[PDB]
Symmetry: D2
Subunit: 219 residues, 4 copies
């Protein structure tokens, strides 16, 4: 397989949030079969970012998901040709983001080319006022729709003070070659900022993801 136990990552994101332009570059590595990955991210343009960094972090690759043998792995099967994804993020206060990513593989290194755009965030809301602490862990529901893979996930940002701020993700994952399609299943996630400097010009980011069916038996 072209997907090895250890792989490197490189990425570039260009984007806008409430009209503010930025560029972030990243480098990292992970373990595709263990479903883990870590990245170091640097703001190259647009510093200091005027919005909560957490809204970007899920845009920074389901290759890094532990898949059981009894669920076809849409993402690992897509290589060497790779895949792209498209996502909407609908926040409960009217903010909306779109993001797209093209994921290629060269040697032992994945390359992500990412575009991110966020509009209509209230100026005194938790995103523009940087009141978020983290995303909660989540469970994404994966299902085939019109020959490609969809994932929907109810996400929540934990806020300063302990409340939550909700966002609904819908992502379409699109292999560049025919791959064996999976039945309805779940991907559990936990994404975490491990460290950052004052204005998030430098961030270390981690994610762990594991695919499964329901653990509750039938009938």
């Amino acid at each position: 397989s072209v997907i090895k136990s250890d792989m490197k990552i490189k990425l570039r994101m260009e984007g806008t949030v409430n009209g503010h332009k930025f560029v972030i570059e990243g480098e990292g590595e992970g373990k595709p079969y263990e479903g883990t990955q870590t990245m170091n991210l640097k703001v190259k343009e647009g510093a200091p970012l005027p919005f909560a960094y957490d809204i970007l972090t899920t845009a920074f690759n389901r290759v890094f998901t532990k898949y059981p043998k009894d669920i076809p792995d849409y993402f690992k099967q897509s290589f060497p040709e790779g895949y792209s994804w498209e996502r909407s993020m609908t926040f409960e206060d009217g903010g909306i983001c779109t993001a797209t990513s093209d994921i290629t593989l060269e040697g032992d290194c994945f390359f992500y080319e990412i575009r991110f755009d966020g509009v209509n965030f209230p100026p005194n809301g938790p995103v523009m006022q940087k009141k978020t602490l983290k995303w909660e862990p989540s469970t994404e529901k994966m299902y085939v729709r019109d020959g490609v893979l969809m994932g929907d996930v109810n996400m929540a940002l934990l806020l300063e003070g302990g409340g939550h701020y909700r966002c609904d993700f819908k992502t379409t994952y699109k292999a560049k070659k025919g791959v064996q399609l999976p039945d309805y299943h779940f991907v559990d996630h936990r994404i975490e900022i491990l460290s950052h400097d004052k204005d998030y010009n430098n961030v270390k980011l981690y994610e762990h993801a594991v695919a499964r069916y329901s653990m509750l038996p039938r009938q």
Copy 2:
């Protein structure tokens, strides 16, 4: 506790779907601490129902959820006084349902007083054409909001001929007395029609639900 290991259930649902009125009564039982329950449901008015029975089934009580000791159990704590819930169901093709339930307890038996209303289902869609097979198992996200408990769940009906039909649930669960509130957590579900007669006048329904935190370890 007032919540025993084995409990009975009765219910009455009155509702409408695309203007069609119906009444369903139920009797069943469950195991609150195992998170399991079974119900037998009878259509009393509105037969034969002209829509997919599956849309009703999640309206037919989070008391029946296995809660680990390290997550406060909002539902069991609420008794004897009990609790109510309110729910919206937003389907991907424009259909919307509202449902409400008042859950009371007398001796070993719960009563659910349920109202269900669905509007704007496309006439050739899978609900009005009875093309649903089941709900998939799910994971509901539970969190406190304005002093009460909210659950959001991405639901999916498996369709005849394959494919899924999506619905987003938002539920507010409202205890009738002060209880210890939980942190953010998950409830995994699997709801199943075990058996039915041809027009779904008689249905046997089962649900299993278990609460948890994420099993993925924290690295930060």
Copy 3:
């Protein structure tokens, strides 16, 4: 026709908002061809209502719409058999209402059988805190879908101390007999409470509605 220049109205609404049960009865009259109507409403059960009365008022009949001769009038054509409607009301803070009505005619009097249910209104929001002043006038977009008539309208409640609270309506209108279907068009509305008592146990309600095409010429 059976629809005269002056008609009477009687109604009963049964409903729940945030679990609170109520019944309201109404009697009024209107001028179908002018598109105007007035009703007196009385809370019979559930007084004093603990939520903004404004959320109910649009559930208290498009027969009362002035239709120009060059737009088929879906509603007037449906009588004497009549029509039913179904509506969702999606508020910007998560509140959702469903409403249904069956509209019949006996002699000179319409009868409306209404069901109304509202869920998930935030306890400190403008509906549960009774901070609404009125609905703004509106323009509903009418179009055929699956052989019946659909209406979508962006609605807004003007609030105390300023600002607006948004709600999106989707209504399906279903004639009990076949009628000539209209092309895409608009219904302009203005709904107003003319008077009320302290707790809104008694309310006098008015609406004016007029159908049109766009007034802007093609090129």
Copy 4:
């Protein structure tokens, strides 16, 4: 600085279902009559694989006839100008975001536009180019958090008949203090006047007029 006749240039860069493109435009209009025309040319990404109509409302509320009794947020904002941000939520799950920065030099506006569309179904009307036009519309304008919001229920007329719905939410952001209007309406009619194969060249027109409801107030 806003004259009876003004010119326009623009550049849009964007993506729809992952497909990148660039379009440039030049046109002119009459700010006080609320009319404008532009000629648009695809510079990158030809042939566009999606319905051109989804782009056309991104290609300036300066071109709106405002009556004297409604403050004109857009014309007041110059010379400094304004930006806007928009979401377009289609009924089949497609979502677009768009942003534009509008500047003025001499007699000529420049629009710098970004447009991104995601999650359009592959056999839907957008990816299958099944749209004929947008219907005329009425946008609801209201102040929110010191800037002007507009919400509009939009509909694409389809080949064969029927409509495909999209809801727009736009935030209009002046770069200086301006007199804020009360709640009001902007009526629109946007039309492609001509185009060549694959819409490499398009002539686009819009007419827009602001108003209050002319249904008279009855309440004291």
